[PDB]
Amino acid sequence: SYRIVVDPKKVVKPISRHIYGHFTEHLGRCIYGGIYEEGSPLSDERGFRKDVLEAVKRIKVPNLRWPGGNFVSNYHWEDGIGPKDQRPVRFDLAWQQEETNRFGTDEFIEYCREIGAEPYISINMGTGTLDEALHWLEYCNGKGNTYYAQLRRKYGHPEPYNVKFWGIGNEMYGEWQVGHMTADEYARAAKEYTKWMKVFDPTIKAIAVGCDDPIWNLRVLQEAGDVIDFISYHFYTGSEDYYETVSTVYLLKERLIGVKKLIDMVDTARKRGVKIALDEWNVWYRVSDNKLEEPYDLKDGIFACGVLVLLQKMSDIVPLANLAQLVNALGAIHTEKDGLILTPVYKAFELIVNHSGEKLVKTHVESETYNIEGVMFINKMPFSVENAPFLDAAASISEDGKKLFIAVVNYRKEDALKVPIRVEGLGQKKATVYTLTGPDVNARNTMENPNVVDITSETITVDTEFEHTFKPFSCSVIEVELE
Amino acid sequence: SYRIVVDPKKVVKPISRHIYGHFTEHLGRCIYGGIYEEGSPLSDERGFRKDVLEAVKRIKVPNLRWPGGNFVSNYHWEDGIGPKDQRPVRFDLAWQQEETNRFGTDEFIEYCREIGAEPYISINMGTGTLDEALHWLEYCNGKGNTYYAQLRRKYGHPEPYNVKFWGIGNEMYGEWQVGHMTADEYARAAKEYTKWMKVFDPTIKAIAVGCDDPIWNLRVLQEAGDVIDFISYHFYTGSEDYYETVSTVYLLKERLIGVKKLIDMVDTARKRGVKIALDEWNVWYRVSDNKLEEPYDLKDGIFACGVLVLLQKMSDIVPLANLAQLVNALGAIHTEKDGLILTPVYKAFELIVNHSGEKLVKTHVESETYNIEGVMFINKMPFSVENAPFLDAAASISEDGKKLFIAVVNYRKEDALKVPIRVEGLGQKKATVYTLTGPDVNARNTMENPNVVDITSETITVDTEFEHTFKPFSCSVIEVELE
Amino acid sequence: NFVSNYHWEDGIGPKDQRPVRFDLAWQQEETNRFGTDEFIEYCREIGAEPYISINMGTGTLDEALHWLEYCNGKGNTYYAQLRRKYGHPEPYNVKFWGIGNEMYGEWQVGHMTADEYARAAKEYTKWMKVFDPTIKAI
């Protein structure tokens, strides 16, 4: 048996806007050819691609991370400010590219404003400096007469940017990272940058680097949990098999619950309420070059929907997440010289960001269960998840709250499910069901039939007790007025 | 608000015999004047207090921990064997008492096999050797002609004692432990002692010492997770206010979930499936001499009930547990030279051990929630626990089994709880409801009113959907037939 | 590996009073009816200079010192007096001593990190050579 019980009067928690966040690295064709193509017919006066822009605005990005990623660990921000024709051309050691630097801090901040998204920038901790990081903070944030607040104005922007999220470094644990650190080194320095940045601007929020290594997380929280706001986490998954993929959602629930408990275990961290930032996540397993153009299909898009529902459930533990990445490289959107595809990862966002609430409301959900051992990620590392649901849900309420949104995923590959839903003190009412699904589980959109996987709509009679059938391998939200 | 639904047909996972274990340390009158009083009219030929013996059998001890506790770290087991008149009188550093060693290893296996419990002995890591622990193991478990087998045999016992559980040192992390160790040096020591003890007897089960320091745990697990079976936790709570005391049940839950998560984050240990051993727990707040005669009132019996209900629900994570302690010192049982007393803590055990099943069966519960911020333990450590329930429960079945049980707890101090209970495909049966409760939260059994708090029975009827009302601050088991 | 678990005193005296132990190294009961006295007898039978390995796994500085004494002392020291008591007035004069055995490998009982071995190898040797300067230490 399956069942879903709701109560639109029992609010459990707020749901943070910023669980729906995004990410744009200078990697491959993510910026250049991506959101920003200069010579193009499809561009505007600034160089932004108008089609991509219209697509991104439909998602309504809450915040947007930049410029990396493994690019920033090697990146001097000043290289990318002022007259475009005197920006030096640099070598990006991360992804072996020439960097023209004609998309920089202003250009990026402009892109944020245009779409309506809080900028979240990451400082360079492998090649950079306290100074350089502070100077970047002054330039973006200073309202006094400091030389850098002077220089932003000099280049056309008198008002400060007030950029509230800062990322104290990127993936500083890895061999692959330029100027990579030990747990102890990084811990000591996560503290130094954070604390000094905050002296200048006590209103910024700091995300320190976390990972799977628990000793690393613990040393971070211990040294810096006095002053950080988030410890970051990275989750990439695969591969090849439907069930293996659409279930690492529950691997991620388990892994996030871990980091949360490490936080609990550290005094100053627990005391302040340090939180978790899922500041990189996606499916990735097919591609291993440095353009990362991962051909996402519907199974990947069901993983995303599952994440987003989960995040709705634990937005209090993890109030900030960023899909890696926004365009092309591991991209929800894929662009060529003359058009774009919106992958099923993207569509997942289209379904859930529109049609969802600000307050999570009590939701019991009965489901049948399974266990899987399988693989994930490019390197194939084995994983194992026991008691993964076939059906999952999270209901929410609007600020109003005369609007209930009921998000429900069906993980089943073959059988549709008839689920008896109950919603206290309601009905009867006409209501609308939005459903993201397609034919195969390997189904893609193409820039030809760019609508094989898309969001459908249909009207339904609901009441304080009703029923519904959920297509196999689909996500669907029921939207219903409560007045 | 409140609800309980049970489905006797969905077996979730088994319930381990050993969550009901106990602990018998040489501390104050716990052992001498406790279970053992030589010249006593109340004692048998070999010196076992007959009243206590029968008190103890009722509780069906699954396993008995001995001899410590902080005592073992100063303890040389050799001193405790042989004809009693030749044993040396020694000074226990742990509790500043003269130990006569008239109670030792043989007496303890007699007391164990006299009451049905598996021996579980803690070796001396603070004042003793590998060799010394190994000869202990040889003495208890050796079939062949090694000297310490021979010696067991000279003293009256041809057959091996086959002692299954060995704990590798005691609270070795603590400043108070004699020969206390750093995380790194103990982690090395755990692997070693374990490793070699399992070369002699590969069938034993070794409990490693863990604590509250996450790094401590992580190092033991990284080093010894190869060969250990359990890492151990120790929980002592209170205090003074009813709610601040009961509900640390829900502090303990969080604490334990934290530690499992540690195990998940270490490969060898995760891969081997190292579990938890709660090898020391109780209420302990109002006394800190060195006989520790805590006068437990009824709130403490309710915490015990909660803890045991919690254990039923998670005995797959924590397979083994030990109340601290059995007699006198932090005792469930209190004894004087004439009679004895059964505290509400013991009573909690009488209630659950008789009338509980061996297979946990699906138990969903809905309940109201509180947030508290209190103090706990001897030193009054501040704490809080968020969303603690006023009502909890756990349903189990006999092995066969024509008997469902429903253990349920009302933490509410003032109100009774009117609870609708559902049970799949059941009568129309009658059923007995066993309930432990007293006049007020401060109720306490006495040697002349030995019943002020006690388990009472009453017959109700159940109907696959039915209602019951649980007294305030009460624990009840509902025993229903099924055939 | 036998040695890093061995207590030399178990293999001396009347054999009937000698204790049976458990060899952790090879998982075998050891009756200790072949021991130090027995080993040196066999050595001078075949004319081989004896070469003794000391237990650094579960043994102490003291324990090793006492072995050398038993073997090489000609004073009226407890352990020399002991060798004499058991039949051998005149010392064995063993020339090659082995300062632990394979103390680097996970399999050795009592094994050490390089720093803790070098530290101890220094310490065992200097003090043995103070009792008897003629020995050669491996």
PDB file of C-alpha atoms in Angstrom, chain A residues 10 212-215 217-219 222 254-255 257-262 264-266 362 364 366 368, chain B residues 10 212-215 217-219 222 254-255 257-262 264-266 362 364 366 386:
ATOM      1  CA  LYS A  10       0.540  22.038  10.337  1.00  0.00           C
ATOM      2  CA  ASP A 212      33.699  13.271   2.533  1.00  0.00           C
ATOM      3  CA  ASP A 213      36.827  13.073   4.642  1.00  0.00           C
ATOM      4  CA  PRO A 214      35.392  13.462   8.164  1.00  0.00           C
ATOM      5  CA  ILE A 215      38.694  14.531   9.755  1.00  0.00           C
ATOM      6  CA  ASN A 217      35.154  18.513   8.196  1.00  0.00           C
ATOM      7  CA  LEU A 218      35.883  18.222  11.896  1.00  0.00           C
ATOM      8  CA  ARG A 219      39.056  20.327  11.769  1.00  0.00           C
ATOM      9  CA  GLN A 222      36.682  23.282  15.135  1.00  0.00           C
ATOM     10  CA  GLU A 254      22.331   9.683   4.170  1.00  0.00           C
ATOM     11  CA  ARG A 255      25.534  11.649   3.386  1.00  0.00           C
ATOM     12  CA  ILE A 257      22.656  13.574   7.589  1.00  0.00           C
ATOM     13  CA  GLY A 258      26.309  12.654   8.260  1.00  0.00           C
ATOM     14  CA  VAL A 259      27.770  16.160   7.847  1.00  0.00           C
ATOM     15  CA  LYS A 260      24.850  17.543   9.888  1.00  0.00           C
ATOM     16  CA  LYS A 261      25.884  15.237  12.718  1.00  0.00           C
ATOM     17  CA  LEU A 262      29.552  16.267  12.575  1.00  0.00           C
ATOM     18  CA  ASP A 264      26.203  18.722  16.013  1.00  0.00           C
ATOM     19  CA  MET A 265      29.447  17.286  17.424  1.00  0.00           C
ATOM     20  CA  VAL A 266      31.372  20.564  17.446  1.00  0.00           C
ATOM     21  CA  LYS A 362       3.270  18.114   7.554  1.00  0.00           C
ATOM     22  CA  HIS A 364       3.180  11.560   5.952  1.00  0.00           C
ATOM     23  CA  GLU A 366       3.616   5.528   2.891  1.00  0.00           C
ATOM     24  CA  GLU A 368       7.015   0.303  -0.700  1.00  0.00           C
TER      25      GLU A 368
ATOM     26  CA  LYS B  10       5.464  -6.149   8.441  1.00  0.00           C
ATOM     27  CA  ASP B 212      32.024  12.104  22.887  1.00  0.00           C
ATOM     28  CA  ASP B 213      35.082  13.429  21.076  1.00  0.00           C
ATOM     29  CA  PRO B 214      34.410  12.735  17.379  1.00  0.00           C
ATOM     30  CA  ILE B 215      38.142  12.553  16.524  1.00  0.00           C
ATOM     31  CA  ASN B 217      36.039   7.737  17.730  1.00  0.00           C
ATOM     32  CA  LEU B 218      37.251   8.288  14.209  1.00  0.00           C
ATOM     33  CA  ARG B 219      40.815   7.192  15.055  1.00  0.00           C
ATOM     34  CA  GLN B 222      40.214   3.968  11.310  1.00  0.00           C
ATOM     35  CA  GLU B 254      20.637  11.969  18.494  1.00  0.00           C
ATOM     36  CA  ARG B 255      23.938  11.033  20.216  1.00  0.00           C
ATOM     37  CA  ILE B 257      22.731   8.473  15.409  1.00  0.00           C
ATOM     38  CA  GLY B 258      25.813  10.717  15.424  1.00  0.00           C
ATOM     39  CA  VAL B 259      28.085   7.755  16.180  1.00  0.00           C
ATOM     40  CA  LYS B 260      26.576   5.368  13.606  1.00  0.00           C
ATOM     41  CA  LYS B 261      27.240   8.131  11.124  1.00  0.00           C
ATOM     42  CA  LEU B 262      30.909   8.053  12.193  1.00  0.00           C
ATOM     43  CA  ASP B 264      29.461   4.984   8.018  1.00  0.00           C
ATOM     44  CA  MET B 265      32.332   7.339   7.297  1.00  0.00           C
ATOM     45  CA  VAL B 266      35.052   4.762   7.845  1.00  0.00           C
ATOM     46  CA  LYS B 362       6.103  -1.798  11.712  1.00  0.00           C
ATOM     47  CA  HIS B 364       4.295   4.369  12.791  1.00  0.00           C
ATOM     48  CA  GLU B 366       2.154  10.582  15.347  1.00  0.00           C
ATOM     49  CA  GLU B 386      14.304  19.811  19.750  1.00  0.00           C
TER      50      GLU B 386
END
